[PDB]
UniProtKB/Swiss-Prot annotation, chain B:
Gene3D superfamilies: Glutamine Phosphoribosylpyrophosphate, subunit 1, domain 1. GO terms for cellular component: centrosome; cytoplasm; cytosol; extracellular exosome; nucleoplasm; nucleus; proteasome complex; proteasome core complex. This is Proteasome subunit alpha type-1. It comes from Homo sapiens. Belongs to the peptidase T1A family. Induction: Induced in breast cancer tissue (at protein level). Up-regulated in liver tumor tissues.
Swiss-Prot record, chain C:
It comes from Homo sapiens (Human). Belongs to the peptidase T1A family. The lineage of its organism: Eukaryota, Metazoa, Chordata, Craniata, Vertebrata. GO terms for cellular component: cytoplasm; cytosol; extracellular exosome; extracellular region; ficolin-1-rich granule lumen; nucleoplasm; nucleus; proteasome complex. It is found in: Cytoplasm; Nucleus. NCBIfam families: PRK03996.1. This is Proteasome subunit alpha type-5.
UniProtKB/Swiss-Prot annotation, chain G:
Induction: Down-regulated by antioxidants BO-653 and probucol. Down-regulated in response to enterovirus 71 (EV71) infection (at protein level). It holds the Pfam family Proteasome. One of its GO terms (biological process) is proteasome-mediated ubiquitin-dependent protein catabolic process. Its main location: cytoplasm. This is Proteasome subunit alpha type-2. The gene is PSMA2.
From Swiss-Prot, chain H:
Keywords: Chaperone, Cytoplasm, Endoplasmic reticulum, Ichthyosis, Isopeptide bond, Membrane, Microsome, Nucleus, Palmoplantar keratoderma, Ubl conjugation. This is Proteasome maturation protein. Constituent of preproteasomes, but not of mature 20S proteasomes. Within the preproteasome, may directly interact with PSMB1/beta6, PSMB4/beta7, PSMB5/beta5, PSMB6/beta1 and PSMB9/beta1i. Interaction with PSMB8/beta5i has been observed in PubMed:10973495, but not in PubMed:10926487. Forms tetramers. A motif (High-affinity association with the preproteasome) lies at residues 45-49. It comes from Homo sapiens (Human).
């Protein structure tokens, strides 16, 4: 017996100037077979905060079903809505509550701050948050990140100016990076779901990706 | 006067046979403010009233919140109100977490009655003093369930348990024909007109003493207060007489 | 036909023929045997002023402190019994610090009044209590919604208020407050009005050794007026 | 318990009288006659016939679910008399105790152990200041492989004993006197003689005629240790054979 | 009740025989308590002590209002039909109170001495109050009218108390009352005690006219409906010529009720 | 014997337990209910005292179900009735959970009677004030009826009546032939009984609730269809001259 | 008296009303006599089962413990069987450890403590019973008597029970030590005869000796032989 | 799995091995009477009805609270014939008899812990 | 309306606390005053009882090397409280390597007193303390507990029967001059205690404490010498 098994996935998050973007491939694969091809991995929490949860698909559901309940409890108690600056600490506490039986997840939080500003957090299986700007991660990580490091925040480039990220550029970059990284990895592909979120709500997006 | 020895506690039967503490609690629940509980085919308005400790202070809360599809009122003791709404909220949250459907009112009210039945039997405990008017629409049309100090809940169509309200009952019974096919505005007008009878003469309903709360088909339970209740409180004719 | 002596005030859970739980009513009545207090809510912060009534000159003035910190932006003025108020303050401090550790943000005054009232509601039947808390608090502070001042009575409620006294001769400190309140006056006049009101109840005179003015501003944290600072305003 | 013990010399179980008598248990003894019944159990030399009385308050009530003769083990009976609401519980308690003993020692219980266990668990209710001594008359019946048939009686106080004949109910005194008079005359008995003696004692105590279907009879015999209840036919035959 | 497990609890008494049966060190505590609880008259002229109220002057009408509702009714309806001056009040130290017991004197024909006393007199101070207010043997021409309000959960009837109609008026009249009654008299099973009963008993035993008026309201907090229910009272010779302005008095009563006296925070 | 009637664990010089008798008397001041068994089924009927027209059908009912083939017709304090119904539901549920098939009626009736007796043995809880009927049906055993008194009685009745109007109901039921009848005329007989014994000076509104289990429903408990109820109502109304 | 009705309160003179009441109760019971002799001890008592409806077997009074300890009650019938069972359990508990039989004194102390434990508490009545126990250890005979509160005494010729003052007065002029069981049994029979309300029969005496063999209980025919002699 | 949300009074007990049972006859010996009572209660509740376990356990509770204070040895004469172990002497009273306790606590602390106030 | 702690009166006035205070106002007196760097904790002995030994019966108990103790009232309850305070002091020192301040330990004692007033099954501790000692920062400190729950940072107060007279005498003479040197404080406290007692020296005990010199009781010879020195009044 072994109370752990892999299920793949990939999470990418770009925190621009006044827009957060969370996108993820959709394929539940364990062992060598494929279970389904829809399996969305981008759940909504509030009107201005989206959670992306990769990793083992037995706790990715439990944490999703617990966070909403605790959010409802907080809203009923304090008569407000949790901002994206508190959900990080609350989820970190929940994750660390079982340090001797760790959750096998890799969560990504994206949303808007008190003012119009991008913000993407990042956790670890034991649970320790850290603010970031373009952090990605998941099963097929270590390939998504370096290209973003090259593009978003210009590194190891000289005699080049700095330009803020425009919304038209973000989707064009994300689609290209997923298309490039889908071929060389096994667990990725199938359908891609984008959850770009702005100060007017949440809008979805689905495109094809290496049809399988 | 043959009752001094048979009312000091709750676990004793009078020679006639009746628990006097239950009657005393049912008399006690009449201390508060009126609360009409009208219902319709699509919406279940819940209009209440608010008192005032003083001109300087602020008013009490009479329309709490339970979940996205259910909202309770209150009348009587304000102590046990929170202690019971906590159980309300916990049961609704557990039903949403274990299963994946909203908890129907017909089971929630039975659970509340079962919980409130315990203290009326064991020694050293006293019955609750609430007058809940649980309202909410889940799957088979909106419902209006009343709760008494004794664990004896009633189904209902429209009633105004609370403070001086017999005239409110008479008015609500006189016009209990049109409440089956009307829009939201007409139903709210009827509710406010019914509540106006409770208020003493030469007194009008201001903006700061009404707590209209509406739950229906495609809108979650929302509480209205302050100037937001003005659009509902516009026509109301001009005076009861 | 006959008159019989029937008592229902003995027993913490006994309903009288017409309601009105007698034990809680007596607990509320017991508040008046204490010290007066006042609190004014103003658009630019709130103010508090609580008397001391020193028993003997040998008692150190700072030994007794009705004003007490709860956090960097919340202050309250106890009254009545002392030890029970100390227990309530300790629980409130523990609760607010625990919430700060958990959710990583600041308190909201309603979110702590609810907690303290929920704790005080446990009267009845386990270190559970057996009598109502014969105390009263005037929570004050500033939050995102602005400056607020909450009143919490021994039984179960936390009704919002703008200016409501709690100590003895509350009628004199209430009618005058109703007559003088303006809802738009400046913070500077609040100190003067509160001192004038407090002068009407004391048998003694106004000296800098028995008044504990302590106000909180929207910008600054808790600020407790000192003897030298209070001497300037006590002159007039 | 937040109600206290009522003050008085006879208002609670744990308070002694000035002279030293438990008045509450005496009230419990007086409480058996409140229901109103009579039960007689006589042991001969190879049989343990038990007779009792049955009263139907009206006509609508069924005549098959009002019996006062329950079964404890495969070969032990009881003629419970008094308040039904307490005998109905003592019977279950005795059944559970018998099952536990059979599980722990692996053979059918002698009557004395069951009687002693019932007496002890009834006595333990007369010390704590939270109990009510439930009023019954635990009369046993059965045969033993070492001493023959035996008849034992228990009381709410907890004092059990061994009787060669017993009368329990509202007419205990005269029935006991009649049995005392009859026993001293002859010593040998038989099944028919014991049944006739019990029926005659009941008839001469109640001083009324017995309808063919008014009295049920449960017996145990050496040849048939299994506890069986006499049907209507046998009772009617014995009743019509009596005094003929 | 039972303080701890197994404790013997004595049955609470009804008649009042639980009272038990001295050395000088205890001899004074009783007198200190009595002097603290003693009643004295302190007519606010100049720290006066005053001899009885009716000894210094006679009168014909001595209407007394007991209870906050009655005081509000008298201070709202009959105050503008002339000008009144204060003659005195009293000080009490009952454990249930301390809110005043001030009398009123009309500058016109002084036969009217309407009183306002909302203070709760204890079960023993009432006799001393009667002794210090009336005396031993007053005249035989006075008429006394008393207005009081009681909780509705006192009237006893076969029907449910809650099912009973809105608050009503009941009266109790002595033998020496030629005038009729404007409302049905109280039924036999119901009795009234305390200060109104003491006043009625004194009036009956000293052979002077008297009349009692009760209100079985369901709410004890002051309001407008209950005080307005006292309207049919103003049609008898007990109080006829003292009413001169109904609508302005109603307006000032509404304004007084608008003050929003401190209610109970136990409920909502 | 006043003086000893303050706790369950206290006898009387005569020998009776006074709290139990007080509970016995306290069930009288209620409505009335009857129940009859035919050759191949049973049937009940309750005079539901309808309050003001603010309520509606499906209000507080007194014809609960305990299993797929049993049901009660409790008539007393409603909170204790609901508690007892929940206890019996739990009992039948546990029995079916591990012993297969369904509980026989006698065992369930005995268990519920013993449970309701368990309270009158201690000085911590008051006795239940309520009558209790547990008629049901079987496939091979037949049709059985039981009544449970508040204290300990669990006798088996052919047909009885519980509540205030009980003596007249018993006397009128005595003159029937309920041993060779069917389930198509005992309903009319029950209706005529409930309308021949019904006070009108203290009762104003009536609503008969009827239910039968038998060979006509092949072992299932449910309320009678509205057509048969209406026909019986008309026949009973026209039978009174 | 308000200070009565509860065993946890001292009367304002120094006493316990409930304890004295229980002592009077156990005094109002059945007479019993115990005689200590240089060779052994004898315990004599009579039963209320006078009518022939009762039985000689089954219920019995002088229940032996182990092999050297035997007791007899003079109080409430249904209120000492539990105590006897506890005494036997304590004897066996001592016997598993310390592989040698219980001496009398330790058993007396333990039973006295367990009996007293229902005095100092609150809400439970004291045991109404008072029992003698006889032992034979180290070539010596032992006799003790227990009180409802619990205070063992090294008694020698106690005649406690109903009308015990007359028995004590009668015994204070007959016993002279240095006697065998033969005369002791006759002395006990005479003491019972002094107050019996009738004549002794074959089925009214339950004498039991504790000589240096064990705790043999005299057979009914043997009791008949002694009664005739 | 709890955080802190006096160490001299209770100390020197690492969290490591209380969530690690010792020799397998640990949970069958530390908690034996409770397990036997639970099994009997379950059996009675299953076969006889819901009344018997409730009645018997509440009888246990009623008889439990009349013993001496915790800092002294309890005779436990009663509750034993009611439990059913009236004569079932075993490895519970001859080994490490609680009367001769090798270590003993303070009276006030033990009684206040028994009350559950701490 | 005074038969249980949990119940109130129609006006308030929790009566069991007041009765406990009355009981406390029956034992031997006690005083205490701080100076520049000195504290005194003198008490008086009600009876001589020459057969009895003064070694065992005493009031000035030690709580730590920097905190001392003097009570008044029933002895056994005071002993229990002192034992618990000692244990708590040691536990706090173990959990934090820092000598315990006066305020913390006096708050713990006050809380322990107040805990026994929340159920009608436990009587309150009827005693009164005079906690006094030197902090870790060198500032002299003094306090006074109370049976109900309260405590005040008094300066030169007193407890016990006949405390009003000694309190008035102390407040009518306490000045900065009298607290300058060391023996001046002893003279002042002896003059204060000489009022209630009949004859000095016979039944008066002192406990001089200095800066980190630990508690040091005074032998009768030094007390007699100090009384003789203070007898030179003119």
């Amino acid at each position: 017996f072994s109370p752990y098994v892999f299920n793949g996935g990939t999470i990418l998050a770009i925190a621009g100037e006044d827009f957060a973007i969370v996108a993820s491939d959709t394929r539940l694969s364990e062992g060598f077979s494929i279970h389904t091809r829809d399996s969305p991995k981008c759940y909504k929490l509030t009107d201005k905060t989206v959670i992306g949860c990769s990793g083992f698909h037995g706790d990715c559901l439990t944490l999703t079903k617990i966070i909403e309940a605790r959010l409802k409890m907080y809203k009923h108690s304090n008569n407000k809505a949790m901002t994206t600056g508190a959900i990080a600490a609350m989820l970190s506490t929940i994750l660390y509550s079982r340090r001797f039986f760790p959750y096998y997840v890799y969560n990504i939080i994206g949303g808007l701050d008190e003012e119009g500003k991008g913000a993407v957090y990042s956790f670890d299986p034991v649970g320790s948050y850290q603010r970031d700007s373009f952090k990605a991660g998941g099963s097929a990580s270590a390939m998504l990140q370096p290209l973003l490091d090259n593009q978003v925040g210009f590194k190891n480039m000289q005699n080049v100016e700095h330009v803020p990220l425009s919304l038209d550029r973000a989707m064009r970059l994300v689609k290209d990076v997923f298309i490039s990284a889908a071929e060389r990895d096994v667990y990725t592909g199938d359908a891609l779901r984008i959850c770009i979120v702005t100060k007017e709500g949440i809008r979805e997006e689905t495109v094809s990706l290496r049809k399988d | 006067m043959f009752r001094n020895q048979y009312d000091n506690d709750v676990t004793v039967w009078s020679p006639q046979g009746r628990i006097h503490q239950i009657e005393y609690a049912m008399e006690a629940v009449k201390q508060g403010s009126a609360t009409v509980g009208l219902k319709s085919k699509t919406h279940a308005v819940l209009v209440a009233l608010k008192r005032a400790q003083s001109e300087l202070a602020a008013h009490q809360k009479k329309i709490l919140h339970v979940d996205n599809h259910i909202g309770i009122s209150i009348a009587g003791l304000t102590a046990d109100a929170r202690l019971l709404c906590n159980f309300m909220r916990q049961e609704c949250l557990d039903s949403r977490f274990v299963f994946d459907r909203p908890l129907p009112v017909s089971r929630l009210v039975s659970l509340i009655g079962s919980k409130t039945q315990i203290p009326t039997q064991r020694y050293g405990r006293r019955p609750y003093g609430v007058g809940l008017l649980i309202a909410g629409y889940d799957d088979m049309g909106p419902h209006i369930f009343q709760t008494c100090p004794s664990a004896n809940y009633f189904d209902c169509r429209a009633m105004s348990i609370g403070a001086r309200s017999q005239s409110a009952r008479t008015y609500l019974e006189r016009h209990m024909s049109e409440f089956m096919e009307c829009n939201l505005n007409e139903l709210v007008k009827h509710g406010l007109r019914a509540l106006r009878e409770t208020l003493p003469a030469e007194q009008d309903l201001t903006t700061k003493n009404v707590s209209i709360g509406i739950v229906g088909k495609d809108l979650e339970f929302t509480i209205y207060d302050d100037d937001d209740v003005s659009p509902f409180l516009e026509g109301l004719e001009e005076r009861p007489q | 036909m006959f008159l019989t002596r029937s008592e229902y005030d003995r027993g913490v859970n006994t309903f009288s023929p017409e309601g009105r739980l007698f034990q809680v009513e007596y607990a509320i009545e017991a508040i008046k045997l204490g010290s007066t207090a006042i609190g004014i809510q103003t658009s630019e912060g709130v103010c508090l002023a609580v008397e001391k009534r020193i028993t003997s000159p040998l008692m150190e003035p700072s030994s007794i402190e009705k004003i007490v910190e709860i956090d960097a932006h919340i202050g309250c003025a106890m009254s009545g019994l002392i030890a029970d108020a100390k227990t309530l303050i300790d629980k409130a401090r523990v609760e607010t610090q625990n919430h700060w550790f958990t959710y990583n943000e600041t308190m909201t005054v309603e979110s702590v009044t609810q907690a303290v009232s929920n704790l005080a509601l446990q009267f009845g039947e386990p270190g559970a209590m057996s009598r109502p808390f014969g105390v009263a608090l005037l929570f004050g502070g500033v939050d995102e919604k602005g400056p607020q001042l909450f009143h919490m009575d021994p039984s179960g409620t936390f009704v919002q208020c703008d200016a409501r006294a709690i100590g003895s001769a509350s009628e004199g400190a209430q009618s005058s407050l109703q007559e003088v309140y303006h809802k738009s006056m400046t913070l500077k006049e609040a100190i003067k009005s509160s001192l004038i009101i407090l002068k009407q109840v004391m048998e003694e005179k106004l000296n800098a050794t028995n008044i504990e003015l302590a106000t909180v501003q929207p910008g600054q944290n808790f600020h407790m007026f000192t003897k030298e600072e209070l001497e300037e305003v006590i002159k007039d | 318990m937040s109600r206290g013990s009522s003050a008085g010399f006879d208002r609670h179980i744990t308070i002694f009288s000035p002279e030293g008598r438990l008045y509450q248990v005496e009230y419990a003894f007086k409480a058996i006659n409140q229901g109103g019944l009579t039960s007689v159990a006589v042991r001969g030399k190879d049989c343990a016939v038990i007779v009792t009385q049955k009263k139907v308050p009206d006509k609508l009530l069924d005549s098959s679910t009002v019996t006062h003769l329950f079964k404890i083990t495969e070969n032990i009976g009881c003629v419970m008399t008094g308040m039904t609401a307490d005998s109905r519980s003592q019977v279950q308690r005795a059944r559970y105790e018998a099952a536990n003993w059979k599980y722990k020692y692996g053979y059918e219980i002698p009557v004395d152990m069951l009687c002693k266990r019932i007496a002890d668990i009834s006595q333990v209710y007369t010390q704590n200041a939270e109990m009510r001594p439930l009023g019954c008359c635990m009369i046993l019946i059965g045969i033993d492989e070492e001493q023959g048939p035996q008849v034992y009686k228990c009381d709410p106080a907890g004092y059990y004993c061994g009787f060669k004949a017993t009368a329990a109910g509202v007419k205990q005194t005269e029935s006991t006197s009649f049995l005392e008079k009859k026993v001293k005359k002859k010593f040998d008995w038989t099944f028919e003689q014991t049944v006739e003696t019990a029926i005659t004692c009941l008839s001469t105590v109640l001083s009324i005629d017995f309808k063919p279907s008014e009295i049920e009879v449960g017996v145990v015999t050496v040849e048939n240790p299994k506890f069986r209840i006499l049907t209507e036919a046998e009772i009617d035959a014995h009743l019509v054979a009596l005094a003929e | 009740a039972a303080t701890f497990f197994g404790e013997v609890v004595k049955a609470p008494c009804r008649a009042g025989t639980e009272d038990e049966e001295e050395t000088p060190e205890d001899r004074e505590v009783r007198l200190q308590l009595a002097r603290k609880r003693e009643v004295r008259l302190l007519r606010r002229q100049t720290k006066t002590s005053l001899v009885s109220l009716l000894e210094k002057y006679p009168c014909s009408k001595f209407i007394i209002a007991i209870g906050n509702n009655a005081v509000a009714f008298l201070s709202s309806f009959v105050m503008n039909s002339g000008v009144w001056e204060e003659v005195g009040c009293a000080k009490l130290w009952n454990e249930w109170c301390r809110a005043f017991c001030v009398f009123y004197h009309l500058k016109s024909n002084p036969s009217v001495f309407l009183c306002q006393c909302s203070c709760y007199v204890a079960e023993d101070q009432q006799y001393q109050w009667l002794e210090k207010v009336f005396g031993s043997c007053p005249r035989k021409n006075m008429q006394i009218t008393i207005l009081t309000c009681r909780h509705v959960t006192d009237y006893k009837t076969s029907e449910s108390t809650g099912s009973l109609p809105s608050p009503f008026l009941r009266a109790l009249k002595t033998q020496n009352f030629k005038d009729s009654a404007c409302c049905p008299l109280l039924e036999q099973p119901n009795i009234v005690h305390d200060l109104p009963a003491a006043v009625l008993s004194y009036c009956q035993v000293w052979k002077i006219p008297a009349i009692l008026y009760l209100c079985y309201t369901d709410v004890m907090k002051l309001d407008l409906i209950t005080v307005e229910a006292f309207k049919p009272i103003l049609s008898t010779r007990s109080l006829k010529g003292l009413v001169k302005n109904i609508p302005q008095s109603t307006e000032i009563l509404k304004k007084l009720m608008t003050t929003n006296e401190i209610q109970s925070n136990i409920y909502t | 014997g006043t003086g000893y009637d303050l706790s369950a664990s206290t006898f009387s010089p005569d020998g009776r337990v006074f709290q139990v008798e007080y509970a016995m008397k306290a069930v009288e001041n209620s409505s009335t209910a009857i129940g009859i068994r035919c050759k191949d089924g049973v049937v009940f009927g309750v005079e539901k005292l309808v309050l003001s027209k603010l309520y509606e059908e499906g209000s507080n009912k007194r014809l609960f179900n305990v299993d797929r083939h049993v049901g009660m017709a409790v008539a007393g304090l409603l909170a204790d009735a609901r508690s007892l119904a929940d206890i019996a539901r739990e009992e039948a549920s546990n029995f079916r959970s591990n012993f297969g098939y369904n509980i026989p009626l006698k065992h369930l009736a005995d268990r519920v009677a013993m449970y309701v007796h368990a309270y009158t043995l201690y000085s911590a809880v008051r006795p239940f004030g309520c009558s209790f009927m547990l008629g049901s049906y079987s496939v091979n055993d037949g049709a059985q009826l039981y009544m449970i008194d508040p204290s300990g009685v669990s006798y088996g009745y052919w047909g009885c009546a519980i509540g205030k109007a009980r003596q007249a109901a018993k006397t009128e039921i005595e003159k029937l032939q309920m041993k060779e009848m069917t389930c198509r005329d005992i309903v009319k007989e029950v209706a005529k009984i409930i309308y021949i014994v019904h006070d009108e000076v203290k009762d104003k509104a009536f609503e008969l609730e009827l239910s039968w289990v038998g060979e006509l429903t092949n072992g299932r408990h449910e309320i009678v269809p509205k057509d048969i109820r209406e026909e019986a109502e008309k026949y009973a109304k026209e039978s009174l001259k | 008296r308000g200070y009565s009705f509860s065993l946890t309160t001292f009367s304002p003179s120094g006493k316990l009303v409930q304890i004295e009441y229980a002592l009077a109760a156990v005094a109002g019971g059945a007479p019993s006599v115990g005689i200590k002799a240089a060779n052994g001890v004898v315990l004599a008592t009579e039963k209320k089962q006078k009518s022939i409806l009762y039985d000689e077997r089954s219920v019995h009074k002088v229940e032996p413990i182990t092999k050297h300890i035997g007791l007899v009650y003079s109080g409430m019938g249904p209120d000492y069987r539990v105590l006897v069972h506890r005494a036997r359990k304590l004897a066996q508990q001592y016997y598993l450890v310390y592989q040698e039989p219980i001496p009398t004194a330790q058993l007396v102390q333990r039973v006295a403590s367990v009996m007293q434990e229902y005095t100092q508490s609150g809400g439970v009545r004291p045991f109404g019973v008072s029992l003698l126990i006889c032992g034979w250890n180290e070539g010596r005979p032992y006799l003790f008597q227990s009180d409802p509160s619990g205070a063992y005494f090294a008694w020698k010729a106690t005649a406690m029970g109903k009308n015990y003052v007359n028995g004590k007065t009668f015994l204070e002029k007959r016993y002279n030590e240095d006697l065998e069981l033969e005369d002791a049994i006759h002395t006990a029979i005479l003491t019972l005869k002094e107050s019996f309300e009738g004549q002794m029969t074959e089925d009214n005496i339950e004498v039991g000796i504790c000589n240096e063999a064990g705790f043999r209980r005299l057979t009914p025919t043997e009791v008949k032989d002694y009664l005739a002699a | 799995s709890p955080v802190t949300e006096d160490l001299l009074r209770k100390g020197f007990s690492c969290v490591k091995n209380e969530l690690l049972p010792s020799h397998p006859l640990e949970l069958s010996e530390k908690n034996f009477q409770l397990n036997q009572d639970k099994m009997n209660f379950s059996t009675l509740r299953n076969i006889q009805g819901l009344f018997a376990p409730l009645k018997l356990q509440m009888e246990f509770k009623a008889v439990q609270q009349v013993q001496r204070l915790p800092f002294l040895s309890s005779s436990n004469l009663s509750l034993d014939v009611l439990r059913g172990n009236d004569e079932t002497i075993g490895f519970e009273d001859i080994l490490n008899d609680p009367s001769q306790s090798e270590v003993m606590g303070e009276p006030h602390l033990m009684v206040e812990y028994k009350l559950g106030l701490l | 309306y005074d038969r249980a702690i949990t119940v109130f009166s129609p006006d308030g006035h929790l009566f069991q606390v007041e009765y406990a205070q009355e009981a406390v106002k029956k034992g031997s007196t006690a005083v205490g005053v701080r100076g520049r760097d000195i504290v005194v904790l003198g008490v008086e002995k009600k009876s001589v009882a020459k057969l009895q030994d003064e070694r065992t019966v005493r009031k000035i108990c030690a709580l730590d090397d920097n905190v001392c103790m003097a009570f008044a009232g029933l002895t056994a309850d005071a002993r229990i409280v002192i034992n618990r305070a000692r244990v708590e002091c040691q536990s706090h020192r173990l959990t934090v390597e820092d000598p315990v301040t006066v305020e913390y330990i006096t708050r713990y004692i006050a809380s322990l007193k107040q805990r026994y007033t929340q159920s009608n099954g436990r009587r309150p501790f009827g005693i009164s303390a005079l906690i006094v000692g030197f902090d870790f920062d060198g500032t002299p400190r003094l306090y006074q507990t109370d049976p109900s729950g309260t405590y005040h940072a008094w300066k030169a107060n007193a407890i016990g029967r006949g405390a009003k007279s000694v309190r008035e005498f102390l407040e009518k003479n306490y000045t900065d001059e009298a607290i300058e040197t060391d023996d001046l404080t002893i003279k002042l406290v002896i003059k204060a205690l000489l009022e209630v007692v009949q004859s000095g020296g016979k039944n008066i005990e002192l406990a001089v404490m200095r800066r980190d010199q630990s508690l040091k009781i005074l032998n009768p010879e030094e007390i007699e010498k100090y009384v003789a020195e203070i007898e030179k009044e003119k």
